[PDB]
């Protein structure tokens, strides 16, 4: 059953807080995200990337988003879900597990990057699920994901689960 993401800023603790929809023991800011576990959506449009990335733990960030991903990488768990452009197919997602080093950006970045972190993978696949796809395309007010945005709690966490469930579903 897919879930249902209306009504998400009305879920609130007895003190007024946010909480989750999925885990109502996770506390949000009012922007829907976790201070402990936070999620980033990265958008491939290059298969060289992300065979090279499956292969090697190497992941390219942006320089639009890498102060934002640096900053959530020392207070935070930070996991990187990894979808195609085209047809927004799950790739899998990661944990990141270092900070930006300028020093360790792939052969396959250019001049968009600012530098590269090392991941963990959790899970690689490349699969069509309908709810991730929809997810993706409304995870900005309604209109498609911006390559390396942050996403909401509720969004990261069903991402993965979906992604774990579309791995079974074989």
């Given at each position: 059953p897919p879930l249902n993401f209306s009504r998400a800023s009305e879920?609130?603790?007895?003190?007024?807080?946010?909480?989750?929809?999925?885990?109502?023991?996770v506390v949000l800011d009012e922007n829907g995200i976790s201070?402990?576990?936070?999620?980033?959506?990265?958008?491939?449009?290059?298969?060289?990337?992300?065979?090279?990335?499956?292969?090697?733990?190497?992941?390219?960030?942006?320089?639009?988003?890498s102060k934002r991903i640096s900053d959530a990488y020392k207070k935070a768990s930070v996991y990187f879900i990894f979808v195609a452009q085209q047809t927004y197919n799950a790739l899998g997602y990661a944990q990141?597990?270092?900070?930006?080093?300028?020093?360790?950006?792939?052969?396959?970045?250019?001049?968009?990057?600012?530098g590269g972190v090392r991941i963990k993978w959790i899970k690689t696949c490349n699969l069509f699920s309908a709810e991730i796809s929809e997810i993706?395309?409304?995870?900005?007010?309604?209109?498609?994901?911006?390559?390396?945005?942050?996403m909401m709690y509720d969004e990261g966490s069903r991402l993965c689960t979906l992604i774990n469930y579309a791995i079974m579903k074989r």
């Amino acid at each position: 059953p897919p879930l249902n993401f209306s009504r998400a800023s009305e879920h609130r603790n007895e003190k007024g807080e946010r909480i989750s929809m999925i885990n109502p023991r996770v506390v949000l800011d009012e922007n829907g995200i976790s201070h402990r576990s936070r999620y980033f959506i990265m958008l491939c449009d290059n298969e060289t990337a992300i065979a090279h990335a499956k292969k090697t733990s190497i992941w390219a960030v942006k320089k639009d988003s890498s102060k934002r991903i640096s900053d959530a990488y020392k207070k935070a768990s930070v996991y990187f879900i990894f979808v195609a452009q085209q047809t927004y197919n799950a790739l899998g997602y990661a944990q990141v597990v270092s900070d930006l080093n300028s020093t360790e950006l792939p052969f396959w970045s250019d001049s968009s990057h600012a530098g590269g972190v090392r991941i963990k993978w959790i899970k690689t696949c490349n699969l069509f699920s309908a709810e991730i796809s929809e997810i993706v395309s409304h995870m900005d007010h309604g209109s498609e994901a911006r390559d390396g945005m942050e996403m909401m709690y509720d969004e990261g966490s069903r991402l993965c689960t979906l992604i774990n469930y579309a791995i079974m579903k074989r």
